[PDB]
Amino acid sequence: GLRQDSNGKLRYFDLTTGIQAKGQFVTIGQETYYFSKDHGDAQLLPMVTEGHYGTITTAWVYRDQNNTILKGLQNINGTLQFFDPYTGEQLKGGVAKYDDKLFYFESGKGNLVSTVAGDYQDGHYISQDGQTRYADKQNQLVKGLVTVNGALQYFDNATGNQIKNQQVIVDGKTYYFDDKGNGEYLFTNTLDMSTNAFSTKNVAFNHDSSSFDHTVDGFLTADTWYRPKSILANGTTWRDSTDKDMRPLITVWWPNKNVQVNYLNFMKANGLLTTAAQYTLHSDQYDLNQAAQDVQVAIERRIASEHGTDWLQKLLFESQNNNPSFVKQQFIWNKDSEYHGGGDAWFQGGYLKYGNNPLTPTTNSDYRQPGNAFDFLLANDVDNSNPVVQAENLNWLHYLMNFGTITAGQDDANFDSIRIDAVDFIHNDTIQRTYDYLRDAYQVQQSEAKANQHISLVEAGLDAGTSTIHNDALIESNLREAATLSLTNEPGKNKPLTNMLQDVDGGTLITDHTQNSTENQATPNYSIIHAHDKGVQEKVGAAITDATGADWTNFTDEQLKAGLELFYKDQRATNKKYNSYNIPSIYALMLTNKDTVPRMYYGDMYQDDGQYMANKSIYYDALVSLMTARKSYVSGGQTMSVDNHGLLKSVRFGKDAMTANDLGTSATRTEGLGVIIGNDPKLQLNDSDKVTLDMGAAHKNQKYRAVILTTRDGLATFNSDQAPTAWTNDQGTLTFSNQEINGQDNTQIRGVANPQVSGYLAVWVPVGASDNQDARTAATTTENHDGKVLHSNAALDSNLIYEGFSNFQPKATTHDELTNVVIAKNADVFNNWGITSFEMAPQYRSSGDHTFLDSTIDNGYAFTDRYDLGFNTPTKYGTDGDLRATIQALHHANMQVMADVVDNQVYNLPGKEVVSATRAGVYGNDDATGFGTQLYVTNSVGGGQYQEKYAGQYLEALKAKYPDLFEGKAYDYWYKNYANDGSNPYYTLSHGDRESIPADVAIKQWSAKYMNGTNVLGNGMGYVLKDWHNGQYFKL
């Protein structure tokens, strides 16, 4: 070990190999020394006790017992650190010179971990032989572990090839080098194990499963206990082990030196070793190994004293004194070694993509191809490319589309249509096959009569190319996004309303409102401003976190209630910090524009500081008046322009009048409407200027009356002809000005700032409609020949969807407050507004696990058992009985009912397995991180009682009735291409070929073989134990 030479100089010789230590640091008993690179002579580095870490103008520094700033190399608390010799600023993640040699100080704590061969600033990279290399100032290849322009980097010693996206062992230390070759230290490896007689007795009794616990799929974990050959009873007397003897693996074996060091120091601090001896990353391994064997003595004495091991379970594996457990304190066994986050880690810290390993035959897969623009989002990502999962998705769809029949023999209690949740995150083949189901079951492709009985929609725009190719479902129009530019912002922050003249998705036209006199041209679409998520969840989220301090995905009912109070107070004020401006105007656009199906959001009409439908919003009357006027008056062609005062003027002509010169039928006279919208609350007209609405040739010399007028304090609303009136001239033009018409207040145009309008809003309809005029157009049975399921025409436009929930509804405190009970009770209210399609929330039982917003407010999107729609105990919305009664009531009130189909993910599956994992982002793209690729313990097995009962149960019958669904099939779809030069995305026609699928394999419970991946779980890169020297996993 430590030995003096002839002259009394101290030198060090490794305790196992006998190799002299030179140019390195060694801890010996209590002291840490450096041994010079020349003669190997010792220099004692004094232990710094007392003193504290601080800051300076902001840079961390370290001050001694009496407050002096320390400079240079320092031995602090059994670590070596380096502080700039001028500023005293601590170095972290870089090199410093000592003894004219370079040492690296890791980025986490600034601890000295290694020697670096050289530091380079003046050479240059080259490409040779298909590799990247680095040439120094003399144009000579650089080799080994070096720093280049301040980055730690590694060039293969033999070739000079730079290493990228790999973990590399250099001189006994393990590093990761990223996609640019930029490195980071991970851990110091253990040299080699004791081979004394003591160690031979710690060896495992055998390799059988019964010798180890906390195993998964035959692999060992950090939590594993094992049966040794022998037990040092009470620390003194070796005996053969029995089948009742188990000891933690981590009392005898460590994955790296950091963990062994931390282990000895932890056991020190908890009374199982007392010694002046310091244990550091510079300790001789021989001493560390012996120290661990000595801790065993003290462990065995305490096991004899306490007649058991429960104290040791707690000591190593539970939180003690509000600290993480010993295991969880270790880098390789915690989230720090998973490198969470990144721009592609949209939720939950990001994702782990599953792959294959020869040692994991039960979780391997031949599939896992995303087959769409996106892959991961949340929780356990379902592999919807897998043929067995595709069959299961058809099973579940059929279940939902026959839920009343299936569960109660009630054929009037089944869902009619679907929303495809997270459509761009699931494989195109399952989307195409889903649309074939609906074609097979309901003949939607035969005519609008059938298609319009089953109006489905997806959560995407024009990028949902499987949905647009044959318009099997509505895509979302660009109105929301356009309105967010020009209407929803505070004064001074809106763009001009000219962006509302065309509805355009990344440069592609969905529909043009300017002079729309045609049909069957627009892409069938739905228009919204808000939804349960969109435009909402992160604004409430901010009132919550602001009033409370909680995070937007995880809070208590009490903190939520508080945030909602602030939220609604803000909503009802003119000056809004959290809430959207101009909401009634935007609804006016939605509810009068041609060539769309509008969707009403529940939360724009009702407030979540009340139970379902209890508290009307400030906008409620305006939206009711607009839905009422839509049903009575809205039909025919559209025109739209923005005048010289910035006012948007939108006219609908009435039934059968497509252009401004058409006369239509006798019905036309009393149909049509005009809308004037401004976004300038300071608008003032001069005395001579006019604002005109050109109502058209069917509306000459005609009396109009208001639906909506802008007032000082809000909006005046009128649902009858008893309203202020105005007259068209002999050309059909209504004329407004800065003066009132016939002394009628609020008939003049002027900008206004108030809680319901920030700019100007007026809606005018012809006087004289009969009490139940209905300007809607019925669907016909005429056959389609163009290949499209939905067609954007007067009949499709006559539909109206209601999204009948909000995330932030409170839990019901009584049966009568339950959402689904209240919906059934109020079914005629929806009919009277003209709702034709009732979009219910996802009805699946919430996992309740608080791992995301959806599983904290229990909205139905985060579930374990996708067949459990409220059996035994209710969901947030009611029981399975309450659901059937709701669907019944809606149907008897002439509405279709939408099932929110969530194929993307499953939450909270308790059964564990082991699968190969790499970090990935939403796109399914591998991230270059330190975690690399590791076997990983996943929470991947489960489902629930209803998945067990129903999954796969319908497949044999479905293959008999609709055999085509189980065949392979060629199909086309549109594919969104993004341009290099920053010009608009463009669409190309892709071909797909879905596989044949089986009907005889059920997914009764989920497992990893059927998943693409999972959100990161925080277990670490090395929770599944292996030999880090050679990468070999332990396996029973």
Ligand SMILES: [Ca+2]
């Ligand atoms: Ca997915």
Ligand code: NA
């Ligand atoms: Na050694």
